[PDB]
Amino acid sequence: FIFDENVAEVFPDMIQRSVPGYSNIITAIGMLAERFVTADSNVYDLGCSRGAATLSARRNINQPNVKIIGIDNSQPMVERCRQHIAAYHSEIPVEILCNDIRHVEIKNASMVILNFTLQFLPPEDRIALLTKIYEGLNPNGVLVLSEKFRFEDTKINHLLIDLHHQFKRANGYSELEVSQKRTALENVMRTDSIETHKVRLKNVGFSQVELWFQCFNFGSMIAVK
Numbered sequence: 001f002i003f004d005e006n007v008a009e010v011f012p013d014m015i016q017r018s019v020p021g022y023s024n025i026i027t028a029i030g031m032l033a034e035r036f037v038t039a040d041s042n043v044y045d046l047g048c049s050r051g052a053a054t055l056s057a058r059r060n061i062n063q064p065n066v067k068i069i070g071i072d073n074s075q076p077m078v079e080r081c082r083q084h085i086a087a088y089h090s091e092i093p094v095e096i097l098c099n100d101i102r103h104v105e106i107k108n109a110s111m112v113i114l115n116f117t118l119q120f121l122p123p124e125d126r127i128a129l130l131t132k133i134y135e136g137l138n139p140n141g142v143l144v145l146s147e148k149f150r151f152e153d154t155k156i157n158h159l160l161i162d163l164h165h166q167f168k169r170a171n172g173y174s175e176l177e178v179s180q181k182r183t184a185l186e187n188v189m190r191t192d193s194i195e196t197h198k199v200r201l202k203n204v205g206f207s208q209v210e211l212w213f214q215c216f217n218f219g220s221m222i223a224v225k
């Protein structure tokens with residue numbers, strides 16, 4: 001399982017059937033962009049995929065001189081992203097780059113989005129990235145971090161994983177061809193608890209850090225510089 005032509009194609013439907021609340025987060029990201037994106041700044045969408053978060057933010061930014069930069073290291077993903085974005089008109093320019101988030105520069109940002117992406121980085125690479133993001137954000141800038149969480153409490157972790165399997169079934173997740181390779185990946189994915197995420201965000205330097213959304217074992221938080 002890699003992010004190839006096939007995963008890039010079925011992605012909106014795969015993530016819809018597997019991430020509870022996915023869609024509400026995307027809508028909320030637009031609300032957050034309205035609140036946090038300032039004029040004359042940049043907005044980064046890290047591991048941007050098809051550009052759902054990117055367009056949600058773009059559609060809700062009404063400030064001048066704002067630029068969006070989406071980054072995804074998969075070429076198949078980046079091609080559909082750029083094309084998907086050129087299909088909607090806007091006076092806000094968007095540059096989509098094909099790189100690995102660990103090497104990109106982040107500067108003059110009012111908003112950074114890591115929407116279910118951090119979990120795909122080696123655990124030992126996460127602090128460095130979040131640190132670079134903290135340094136690249138302007139004062140009062142915001143990091144929106146959505147992740148699949150693990151729960152220290154075993155019994156709760158299983159209860160939530162089960163609710164997550166009830167949701168996947170309800171949505172016919174297994175109908176997808178990518179369904180099993182995808183499910184194998186999540187089994188070996190090194191996810192963090194919500195508390196781990198908060199403590200690390202605070203250690204990097206963010207002043208405000210809080211979970212603002214959750215549905216079973218998936219959620220999203222915000223860290224304000």
Ligand SMILES: Nc1ncnc2c1ncn2[C@@H]1O[C@H](C[Se]CC[C@H](N)C(=O)O)[C@@H](O)[C@H]1O
Pocket residue numbers: 003015046047048049050051052053054071072073074077099100101102115116117120121
């Ligand atoms: N190191 C990396 N650099 C850039 N993109 C990455 C990296 N690791 C994983 N990715 C990208 O991480 C994404 C995880 Se799925 C992300 C969901 C998407 N942000 C949305 O809002 O719908 C994939 O598209 C994948 O190619």
Ligand SMILES: [Cl-]
Pocket residue numbers: 015116
């Ligand atoms: Cl994903």
